[PDB]
XYZ file of C-alpha atoms in Angstrom:
720
model
C 281.412 1.600 85.155
C 284.344 2.555 87.416
C 285.716 5.958 86.266
C 285.153 7.024 82.606
C 283.646 5.906 79.295
C 284.616 6.707 75.726
C 282.083 6.424 72.860
C 283.471 4.873 69.674
C 281.525 4.930 66.378
C 282.372 1.590 64.711
C 281.992 1.137 60.956
C 283.660 -0.169 57.785
C 286.322 2.557 58.116
C 286.897 2.152 61.847
C 286.617 -1.524 62.694
C 287.652 -3.853 65.522
C 291.276 -3.857 64.339
C 291.479 -0.060 64.434
C 290.150 0.001 68.003
C 292.816 -2.533 69.033
C 295.536 -0.328 67.494
C 294.506 2.571 69.758
C 294.033 0.728 73.077
C 297.215 2.133 74.655
C 296.119 5.660 73.703
C 292.780 5.171 75.502
C 294.477 3.786 78.618
C 297.010 6.632 78.823
C 294.253 9.232 78.327
C 292.614 7.980 81.536
C 289.562 6.101 80.173
C 288.459 2.951 82.053
C 285.743 1.592 79.718
C 285.270 1.622 75.936
C 281.646 2.333 74.980
C 281.011 0.603 71.644
C 278.290 1.197 69.039
C 276.058 -1.862 68.027
C 277.875 -4.993 66.783
C 275.242 -7.442 65.501
C 274.840 -7.777 61.737
C 273.354 -4.605 60.222
C 272.517 -3.736 56.613
C 275.687 -3.473 54.442
C 277.239 -0.028 54.438
C 275.572 0.976 57.711
C 277.347 3.801 59.526
C 275.604 3.367 62.882
C 274.570 -0.286 63.217
C 271.043 0.455 64.504
C 269.381 -1.215 61.471
C 269.779 -4.847 62.583
C 269.240 -7.627 60.067
C 270.432 -10.725 61.987
C 270.618 -11.404 65.758
C 272.773 -14.501 65.289
C 275.816 -12.860 63.673
C 278.457 -10.328 64.698
C 278.764 -7.780 61.853
C 281.350 -8.873 59.264
C 281.991 -5.364 57.932
C 283.426 -4.522 61.370
C 285.691 -7.571 61.371
C 283.432 -10.424 62.448
C 283.296 -12.416 65.690
C 286.957 -13.515 65.564
C 288.175 -9.934 65.678
C 285.553 -8.935 68.249
C 286.711 -11.595 70.747
C 290.341 -10.516 70.167
C 289.326 -6.925 70.931
C 287.689 -8.004 74.213
C 290.621 -10.157 75.349
C 293.259 -7.546 74.429
C 291.356 -4.721 76.157
C 291.084 -6.884 79.277
C 294.797 -7.728 79.184
C 295.778 -4.054 79.394
C 293.053 -3.438 81.981
C 290.255 -1.814 79.951
C 286.588 -2.767 80.263
C 283.900 -2.980 77.561
C 280.324 -1.602 77.623
C 278.317 -2.780 74.581
C 275.351 -0.980 72.959
C 272.595 -3.531 72.093
C 269.336 -2.913 70.168
C 266.427 -5.068 71.465
C 263.449 -3.030 70.188
C 263.489 -3.246 66.391
C 264.982 -4.711 63.206
C 265.353 -3.363 59.678
C 262.703 -4.125 57.031
C 265.280 -5.341 54.511
C 265.596 -8.151 51.939
C 268.546 -9.544 53.948
C 266.479 -9.843 57.143
C 265.873 -13.557 56.586
C 263.521 -13.987 59.588
C 261.268 -11.276 58.148
C 261.419 -12.683 54.596
C 260.190 -15.977 56.055
C 257.022 -14.305 57.338
C 256.482 -12.582 53.975
C 256.712 -15.993 52.317
C 254.785 -18.110 54.848
C 252.457 -15.596 56.497
C 250.925 -16.732 59.776
C 252.379 -20.241 59.325
C 255.940 -18.888 59.594
C 257.549 -19.625 62.987
C 258.666 -15.957 62.984
C 255.181 -14.493 62.792
C 255.226 -13.988 66.592
C 258.788 -12.578 66.498
C 257.554 -9.202 65.151
C 254.809 -6.863 66.385
C 252.211 -7.263 63.606
C 248.615 -6.038 63.929
C 246.624 -9.308 64.581
C 243.498 -8.183 62.713
C 245.317 -7.942 59.384
C 245.228 -11.109 57.281
C 247.693 -9.589 54.793
C 250.742 -7.553 55.798
C 250.712 -3.988 54.440
C 254.219 -3.038 53.307
C 254.389 0.770 52.579
C 257.689 0.787 50.680
C 256.613 2.023 47.239
C 257.481 5.477 45.912
C 254.109 5.599 44.161
C 250.988 3.504 44.548
C 250.836 0.010 43.047
C 249.056 0.880 39.758
C 251.497 3.567 38.555
C 254.541 1.482 39.520
C 253.148 -1.421 37.442
C 252.361 0.651 34.326
C 255.890 2.067 34.471
C 257.167 -1.509 34.687
C 259.175 -1.037 37.901
C 257.830 -4.234 39.454
C 259.535 -7.275 37.993
C 258.875 -10.961 38.663
C 262.198 -12.802 38.642
C 262.276 -16.565 38.138
C 265.283 -18.253 39.724
C 265.700 -21.619 41.341
C 265.342 -20.338 44.911
C 261.788 -19.911 43.584
C 260.168 -16.735 42.268
C 261.009 -13.196 43.369
C 259.510 -9.728 43.045
C 262.011 -6.972 42.273
C 261.480 -3.300 43.010
C 264.735 -1.389 42.526
C 266.910 -3.011 45.197
C 264.057 -4.928 46.817
C 263.864 -8.691 46.367
C 260.743 -10.027 48.074
C 259.744 -13.728 48.060
C 256.722 -14.999 46.152
C 254.676 -17.893 47.542
C 253.412 -18.816 44.051
C 252.902 -17.299 40.615
C 250.047 -16.725 38.184
C 250.325 -15.427 34.615
C 249.983 -11.685 35.301
C 251.352 -9.326 37.947
C 247.892 -8.755 39.431
C 247.053 -12.456 39.602
C 250.463 -13.038 41.209
C 249.983 -10.218 43.725
C 246.627 -11.502 45.032
C 248.188 -14.832 45.983
C 250.744 -13.317 48.402
C 250.662 -12.850 52.194
C 251.661 -9.202 51.938
C 250.463 -6.105 50.059
C 252.687 -3.373 48.583
C 251.503 0.234 49.009
C 253.058 3.688 48.728
C 255.035 5.044 51.683
C 252.034 7.256 52.554
C 249.936 4.284 53.730
C 250.009 2.794 57.273
C 251.866 -0.503 57.905
C 250.523 -3.683 59.534
C 253.164 -3.431 62.262
C 254.611 -1.229 64.979
C 257.438 0.889 63.512
C 260.207 2.680 65.352
C 258.694 6.211 65.344
C 257.560 7.056 61.793
C 260.248 4.973 60.016
C 258.516 2.456 57.718
C 261.722 0.442 57.339
C 262.111 -0.408 61.056
C 259.850 -3.022 62.686
C 259.237 -3.810 66.360
C 260.319 -7.095 67.976
C 258.238 -8.861 70.658
C 261.158 -9.151 73.105
C 258.700 -9.626 76.019
C 258.000 -13.190 74.783
C 260.480 -15.715 76.233
C 261.409 -17.514 72.992
C 261.941 -14.196 71.167
C 264.208 -12.854 73.943
C 266.274 -16.065 73.964
C 266.936 -16.185 70.227
C 267.462 -12.432 69.824
C 270.066 -12.413 72.605
C 271.708 -15.788 71.952
C 274.871 -14.345 70.401
C 275.544 -11.091 72.268
C 275.224 -12.539 75.785
C 277.647 -15.304 74.850
C 280.457 -12.709 74.807
C 282.679 -11.664 77.753
C 281.823 -7.925 77.910
C 281.631 -5.940 81.164
C 278.322 -4.153 80.695
C 275.493 -3.163 78.358
C 273.838 0.015 77.070
C 270.190 -0.608 76.134
C 268.986 1.311 73.106
C 265.472 2.793 73.286
C 264.310 1.036 76.485
C 261.055 3.021 76.312
C 259.909 1.145 73.220
C 259.618 -2.149 75.129
C 256.372 -3.804 76.228
C 257.762 -4.681 79.672
C 261.038 -2.765 80.360
C 261.396 -4.176 83.893
C 260.930 -7.817 82.820
C 263.528 -7.300 80.089
C 266.125 -6.017 82.596
C 265.322 -8.952 84.899
C 265.638 -11.440 82.009
C 269.057 -10.008 81.218
C 270.183 -10.295 84.827
C 269.020 -13.912 85.072
C 271.815 -14.641 82.579
C 274.329 -11.787 82.972
C 274.045 -11.437 86.761
C 275.655 -8.282 88.232
C 277.235 -6.721 85.130
C 276.625 -3.018 84.409
C 273.343 -2.089 82.731
C 272.718 1.479 81.581
C 269.677 2.430 79.512
C 269.073 5.168 76.948
C 266.014 6.871 78.491
C 265.052 10.574 78.496
C 263.841 11.961 81.851
C 261.750 15.041 82.586
C 263.449 17.658 84.815
C 261.651 16.466 87.943
C 261.281 12.836 86.876
C 263.038 9.993 88.635
C 264.222 6.821 86.900
C 261.625 4.180 87.794
C 263.373 1.246 86.118
C 265.613 -1.397 87.721
C 268.711 -0.229 85.824
C 272.103 0.958 87.137
C 271.737 4.326 85.363
C 271.191 6.134 82.035
C 273.389 7.474 79.200
C 273.302 10.907 80.857
C 270.967 13.351 79.113
C 269.870 14.485 82.594
C 273.400 15.645 83.418
C 273.796 17.165 79.911
C 270.826 19.472 80.388
C 271.185 20.287 84.098
C 274.773 21.461 83.631
C 273.970 23.268 80.377
C 271.549 25.546 82.235
C 274.270 26.816 84.591
C 275.823 28.853 81.738
C 272.941 31.100 80.611
C 272.363 34.730 81.634
C 270.161 37.815 81.092
C 266.929 35.963 80.231
C 264.708 39.085 80.198
C 267.058 40.806 77.758
C 267.392 37.772 75.469
C 263.564 37.534 75.423
C 263.120 41.143 74.229
C 265.784 40.897 71.515
C 264.191 37.718 70.130
C 260.617 38.982 70.415
C 261.471 42.347 68.863
C 263.540 40.972 65.980
C 261.142 38.168 64.989
C 258.209 40.215 66.308
C 256.111 37.391 67.766
C 255.247 36.092 71.252
C 254.337 32.426 71.850
C 253.530 30.293 74.916
C 255.958 27.346 75.192
C 253.397 25.100 76.938
C 250.427 25.680 74.623
C 252.716 25.436 71.596
C 254.079 22.018 72.588
C 250.567 20.715 73.317
C 249.243 21.740 69.880
C 252.266 20.380 67.982
C 251.800 16.992 69.704
C 248.144 16.895 68.625
C 249.166 17.689 65.029
C 251.907 15.058 65.128
C 249.373 12.417 66.149
C 246.947 13.404 63.376
C 249.582 13.522 60.614
C 251.924 10.655 61.556
C 250.230 8.297 64.012
C 246.487 8.566 63.332
C 246.007 4.884 62.419
C 247.945 3.460 65.373
C 246.132 5.734 67.797
C 242.704 4.891 66.303
C 243.358 1.141 66.687
C 244.205 1.427 70.395
C 241.341 3.883 71.079
C 239.022 1.250 69.602
C 240.482 -1.517 71.820
C 240.165 0.724 74.889
C 236.649 1.590 73.763
C 237.091 5.373 73.977
C 236.982 8.261 71.517
C 240.078 9.027 69.404
C 239.629 12.682 70.405
C 239.795 11.729 74.098
C 242.923 9.618 73.544
C 244.665 12.240 71.393
C 244.134 14.977 74.010
C 245.548 12.699 76.734
C 248.691 11.945 74.708
C 249.182 15.654 73.912
C 248.842 16.478 77.612
C 251.330 14.150 79.325
C 254.787 15.552 80.143
C 256.800 12.324 80.214
C 258.112 10.089 77.450
C 255.798 7.325 78.730
C 254.024 5.815 81.713
C 254.866 2.430 83.255
C 252.749 -0.268 84.918
C 249.513 1.101 83.417
C 249.708 4.147 85.700
C 247.541 6.998 84.444
C 248.578 10.663 84.627
C 245.496 11.831 86.529
C 245.904 15.546 85.735
C 245.458 14.626 82.065
C 242.546 12.259 82.670
C 240.446 14.477 84.984
C 240.271 11.343 87.211
C 237.704 9.569 84.975
C 237.349 8.109 81.414
C 240.855 6.841 80.637
C 241.394 5.161 84.043
C 238.162 3.158 83.976
C 238.608 2.133 80.337
C 242.072 0.919 81.332
C 240.736 -1.167 84.257
C 238.526 -3.046 81.781
C 241.114 -3.450 78.989
C 244.581 -3.207 80.616
C 246.234 -4.819 77.574
C 245.414 -1.988 75.147
C 246.936 0.619 77.474
C 250.173 -1.378 77.957
C 250.428 -1.401 74.161
C 249.825 2.374 74.065
C 252.815 2.994 76.380
C 255.098 1.715 73.591
C 253.938 4.519 71.252
C 254.076 7.342 73.815
C 257.789 8.028 73.272
C 257.265 8.472 69.485
C 254.736 11.273 70.076
C 257.082 13.110 72.430
C 260.190 12.694 70.268
C 258.662 13.685 66.897
C 256.899 16.740 68.324
C 259.595 18.060 70.663
C 263.025 16.842 69.550
C 262.272 16.910 65.841
C 259.814 19.823 65.405
C 259.656 22.300 68.307
C 263.444 22.407 68.926
C 263.758 23.974 65.455
C 261.102 26.662 66.103
C 261.793 28.381 69.438
C 264.974 30.335 68.745
C 265.736 32.310 71.896
C 269.279 31.000 72.639
C 269.514 27.726 70.642
C 272.298 26.256 72.830
C 269.409 25.117 75.075
C 267.615 23.358 72.161
C 269.000 19.909 72.863
C 267.853 16.300 73.254
C 266.652 15.889 76.846
C 265.879 19.624 77.211
C 262.825 21.396 78.609
C 262.556 24.831 76.991
C 260.415 26.038 79.876
C 263.726 26.344 81.728
C 266.288 29.004 80.747
C 268.826 28.695 83.572
C 269.362 27.019 86.923
C 271.118 28.182 90.094
C 274.116 26.244 91.482
C 271.864 25.321 94.427
C 269.656 23.163 92.217
C 272.666 21.536 90.604
C 273.994 20.574 94.053
C 270.720 18.846 94.953
C 270.796 17.030 91.597
C 274.297 15.796 92.452
C 273.167 14.599 95.874
C 270.561 12.308 94.316
C 273.362 11.019 92.060
C 275.661 9.756 94.826
C 276.712 6.138 94.440
C 274.825 5.476 91.188
C 276.605 4.001 88.167
C 275.121 6.501 85.698
C 276.773 8.675 83.010
C 277.587 12.406 82.754
C 277.243 13.192 79.038
C 277.912 16.449 77.168
C 278.143 15.199 73.534
C 276.605 12.142 71.832
C 275.956 10.725 68.369
C 272.351 11.966 68.726
C 272.759 15.499 70.128
C 271.800 18.449 67.921
C 275.169 20.134 68.656
C 278.517 19.258 70.233
C 279.439 20.612 73.693
C 281.792 23.251 72.260
C 279.081 24.644 69.967
C 276.673 24.991 72.903
C 279.253 26.739 75.104
C 280.206 29.234 72.373
C 276.541 30.159 71.706
C 275.896 30.580 75.463
C 278.410 33.474 75.420
C 275.831 35.510 73.454
C 273.828 35.816 76.704
C 276.865 37.506 78.307
C 276.969 40.272 75.640
C 273.271 40.895 74.779
C 273.608 44.577 73.775
C 276.449 43.949 71.331
C 274.739 40.818 69.964
C 271.576 42.855 69.364
C 273.643 45.494 67.519
C 275.399 42.883 65.360
C 272.135 41.208 64.317
C 270.684 44.548 63.158
C 273.944 45.436 61.391
C 274.059 42.069 59.652
C 270.387 42.221 58.624
C 270.988 45.635 56.998
C 273.945 44.381 54.945
C 272.425 40.996 54.061
C 268.746 41.760 53.398
C 267.489 38.138 53.065
C 264.069 36.831 52.024
C 263.743 34.139 54.715
C 261.643 34.589 57.861
C 263.086 36.694 60.700
C 262.910 33.556 62.859
C 265.068 31.490 60.479
C 267.432 34.410 59.965
C 267.875 34.777 63.724
C 268.631 31.044 64.094
C 271.108 31.153 61.187
C 273.237 33.857 62.849
C 273.474 31.709 66.004
C 274.369 28.491 64.122
C 277.017 30.413 62.124
C 278.645 32.067 65.144
C 278.580 28.813 67.121
C 280.174 26.449 64.598
C 282.457 28.842 62.698
C 285.923 27.896 64.065
C 287.773 27.626 60.708
C 286.865 30.138 58.025
C 284.339 30.572 55.213
C 285.600 27.527 53.327
C 283.785 25.506 50.662
C 283.615 22.536 53.031
C 282.099 24.619 55.853
C 279.686 26.176 53.334
C 278.441 22.707 52.412
C 277.979 21.658 56.051
C 276.005 24.865 56.755
C 273.737 24.654 53.673
C 272.820 21.049 54.431
C 272.173 21.824 58.108
C 269.908 24.773 57.239
C 267.873 22.776 54.704
C 267.333 20.017 57.249
C 266.496 22.589 59.943
C 263.748 24.367 57.971
C 262.219 21.071 56.845
C 262.034 19.821 60.442
C 260.508 23.118 61.643
C 257.680 22.503 59.146
C 256.607 26.152 58.890
C 257.634 27.267 55.400
C 258.647 23.900 53.931
C 258.794 20.226 54.908
C 260.194 16.796 54.158
C 256.853 15.483 52.832
C 256.076 18.587 50.743
C 259.032 20.768 49.822
C 258.593 24.496 49.199
C 261.214 25.130 46.487
C 260.716 28.914 46.463
C 261.595 29.221 50.156
C 264.468 26.724 50.129
C 266.065 28.735 47.317
C 265.868 31.772 49.605
C 267.589 29.818 52.397
C 270.434 28.920 50.040
C 270.722 32.554 48.866
C 271.203 33.571 52.515
C 274.184 31.214 52.801
C 275.868 32.329 49.549
C 275.504 35.994 50.477
C 276.975 35.716 53.974
C 279.860 33.662 52.573
C 280.771 36.200 49.859
C 279.715 39.688 51.119
C 282.954 41.359 52.233
C 281.313 43.840 54.615
C 279.512 41.008 56.376
C 282.619 38.843 56.615
C 284.615 41.730 58.096
C 282.030 42.555 60.776
C 281.359 38.917 61.602
C 285.029 37.987 61.993
C 285.791 40.752 64.487
C 282.901 39.698 66.727
C 283.472 35.926 66.456
C 287.128 35.948 67.627
C 286.079 37.566 70.927
C 283.256 35.057 71.405
C 285.441 32.038 70.558
C 287.993 32.507 73.334
C 285.308 33.032 75.969
C 283.430 29.977 74.668
C 286.563 27.876 75.102
C 286.895 29.007 78.730
C 283.320 27.875 79.392
C 284.025 24.494 77.722
C 286.946 23.920 80.109
C 284.579 24.551 83.048
C 282.056 22.071 81.645
C 284.724 19.394 81.160
C 285.952 19.810 84.761
C 282.339 19.697 85.962
C 281.499 16.317 84.400
C 284.667 14.644 85.743
C 284.439 16.016 89.316
C 280.701 15.430 89.797
C 278.988 12.280 91.088
C 278.146 9.961 88.214
C 280.574 8.747 85.531
C 282.027 11.087 82.861
C 281.379 10.057 79.241
C 283.397 11.273 76.219
C 282.292 11.268 72.577
C 285.207 10.298 70.319
C 287.504 13.223 69.534
C 286.213 15.639 72.181
C 289.605 15.636 73.941
C 290.199 18.695 71.751
C 287.873 21.333 70.260
C 285.081 19.902 68.071
C 282.335 22.132 66.648
C 279.749 19.668 65.319
C 276.202 20.073 64.079
C 273.323 17.604 63.762
C 273.655 14.035 62.403
C 275.272 13.248 59.895
C 277.677 16.094 60.726
C 278.608 14.587 64.086
C 279.279 11.199 62.440
C 282.533 12.151 60.700
C 285.669 10.040 61.407
C 288.277 11.057 64.002
C 292.063 11.214 63.359
C 293.476 9.176 66.227
C 297.126 9.467 65.156
C 296.858 13.242 65.429
C 295.341 12.838 68.893
C 298.313 10.663 69.956
C 300.862 13.383 69.212
C 298.782 16.077 70.919
C 298.534 13.958 74.087
C 302.276 13.299 73.966
C 302.950 17.045 74.147
C 300.110 17.787 76.581
C 300.987 15.770 79.689
C 302.732 18.786 81.229
C 301.282 22.277 81.667
C 302.910 25.197 79.831
C 301.756 28.832 79.947
C 301.753 28.941 76.141
C 298.705 26.634 76.203
C 296.694 29.638 77.372
C 298.524 31.875 74.887
C 297.334 29.870 71.874
C 294.226 27.843 72.806
C 293.260 27.083 69.185
C 295.599 24.087 68.967
C 293.539 22.192 71.556
C 296.446 21.284 73.859
C 294.809 22.939 76.852
C 291.622 20.876 76.424
C 293.693 17.673 76.035
C 295.756 18.487 79.152
C 292.731 19.200 81.346
C 291.099 15.946 80.204
C 294.191 13.811 80.797
C 295.029 15.315 84.227
C 291.557 15.202 85.763
C 290.906 11.662 84.492
C 294.214 10.616 86.106
C 293.135 12.019 89.475
C 289.724 10.393 89.050
C 291.089 6.881 88.330
C 293.395 7.109 91.351
C 290.351 8.000 93.512
C 287.611 6.182 91.550
C 285.757 4.743 94.544
C 285.819 8.090 96.308
C 284.460 9.949 93.279
C 281.625 7.462 92.735
C 280.510 6.870 96.330
C 282.190 9.777 98.105
C 280.563 12.807 99.702
C 279.453 15.939 97.812
C 279.246 19.345 99.523
C 277.897 22.386 97.685
C 279.407 25.827 98.323
C 277.512 29.114 98.158
C 279.424 31.433 95.861
C 278.585 34.664 94.052
C 276.781 34.614 90.701
C 279.100 33.448 87.932
C 280.747 30.730 90.033
C 279.809 27.143 90.968
C 281.732 25.310 93.676
C 281.728 22.122 95.729
C 283.861 19.768 97.840
C 284.246 16.040 97.179
C 284.859 13.628 100.086
C 286.247 16.468 102.249
C 289.534 16.599 100.305
C 289.027 18.217 96.879
C 287.786 21.802 96.441
C 286.369 22.483 92.970
C 285.777 26.054 91.768
C 284.309 26.573 88.277
C 283.153 29.814 86.670
C 279.871 29.785 84.778
C 280.219 33.355 83.470
C 283.126 33.271 81.036
C 283.698 37.015 80.558
C 284.364 37.869 84.222
C 287.331 37.114 86.506
C 286.637 36.245 90.158
C 288.648 36.248 93.394
C 287.924 34.171 96.482
C 289.340 34.309 100.005
C 290.373 30.906 101.307
C 290.113 29.590 104.880
C 292.614 30.627 107.554
C 295.858 28.671 107.462
C 294.656 26.149 104.867
C 297.174 25.389 102.099
C 296.144 23.870 98.770
C 297.795 22.505 95.649
C 296.394 23.284 92.202
C 296.259 19.930 90.386
C 296.435 21.590 86.940
C 299.088 24.316 87.439
C 300.976 22.836 90.397
C 300.847 26.199 92.222
C 300.642 26.452 96.007
C 297.351 28.171 96.853
C 296.676 30.052 100.111
C 294.809 33.086 101.528
C 293.089 33.956 98.235
C 292.645 32.503 94.767
C 291.933 34.184 91.437
C 289.699 32.361 88.953
C 290.814 33.275 85.385
C 290.943 31.063 82.263
C 291.007 27.706 84.092
C 288.840 26.015 86.717
C 290.452 25.554 90.147
C 290.705 21.951 91.356
C 292.340 22.270 94.784
C 293.596 19.403 96.934
C 293.726 20.282 100.636
C 297.329 19.837 101.815
């Protein structure tokens, strides 16, 4: 809403009271709306709040409802708005989820049976939470029947499940229950969120479920809402309408991934911005042909992106979602093979309104089966996003290693770069919409600064090629050439610090997760110890080999400065474009973060206060020593100040794209602000300005006329 959002990760160590203490900092920075993480009661010790255990309570670990209302009123007093993240799709399978425990105790007689998406054909609820199958767990004596006064209880480590009645033996007791315990390998009797057994779907499309689940959160005076995983819902449009029947015209943005040529079909204000994140990211990549050869020659293997993605999707269905897909194929009355091929073929997260993707259904079988049983297909649409996400985001993104800065959530690896002309058109479609411009989130594989530093490798392909060969000769590792190639990129991109013990730990953990997700030489479900040991040997060697360290350090320092210049361009781009700029906590300065949990570390706000205090006025020494982050803080503060002063104009105002030479991207906003940004960090450009026209550089204060040089900073020029 209005001019700028700021994402805050709330938890036990950064609660409602801490947010309140920093409100004046957020207002002075230029932010108009705080973008808060989920606030309803989650499982104790949760760091993200997405594992909801009670819809009727504000989380007490964060400060409770009293402190939440104080936060809202105080923010409003100083003029700040609030956009709240809410989770309507699923709840946590946890002993503290009392609504769920009621179903486990009462079965189909529980009033909450219809609250969750259980498979109707199952008389007993399969609960795949055991580390081993029932028999072995019982012989080991891990299952314990506890007699209390609240009745009887079954205990499995930290699980405490209710018993309806008891016999005189574990087996006799277990056959009298409404549920059945099985190992994690077995399919559940409910829709999960992706492949997570401990997350269960909620039937929010049913009126009484919507009302109870939203009774607390809509009772609060917030300014807008961010809807988590909108694509999991049975009827996304009805849900939005139901919200508006109560909330009226408040801001509603949804978390929804779009294809490159896909248009948002929902009745929402906008999205969290992955479309902007990837469109802008592509403006910074060069020398595709050369990067292809280097990759293909080093790893020595050529693959088709399209065919690869199609086959991984088919494997993902067979290994993770076979049961769910077989159920729906049965209800549609078609072959599992036919259904699996259709799901592996579609290029969108999901379809809406039972619309079939004809190019994947050769205009026959699936469409007619859907006309007869529309219900089964509507149900299938809820699982479509899981297939896409597990195959692409969590498998393929870790395999194709030509320039990994492109391997991000919301990406399409079939695209390597995009001309400024296509970005301009994208911005035209954006005009007037209350949608976000994101560059870093709590879910992105890397932070914006990591992506910009890695993109510099495409500007120096010959030297990069030479370094990789040099490094491989010194460090002769026993990992695949593909994993080795990716490692060098991850290392160069996140380095900023030194070969410390803390950085070594972050790297090791990231690499182990990376190879397991790739699923080529090891995996989460079946770990290859031999290979993982080799991955860890690679890390120890590069962190201790003096010849490697020497070579690496000389190359990295050159790359770092150029990467910072590109980050400044990206920051100016998201604030000056149509749409609303979003900021992940702490990105006011340089932040080189890797994949979750690395990006979930706390931010030092006191330190940020002092940097802002000495960064409200431009000094040439900011360019002299960029490492301190003052230049990034100054650019953020200044542009957000201009934006707030002209908020309406930036949101609804005109956008005019300029045709510049390769390496530059330029445009004019509402016929008053000329924006020149360089996409190629290693080159300096010069541009002749219009006859007579005088301009004022908003960042440096200089008077600009006749010609302008584009060096380390983007040029934001106000016609005078």
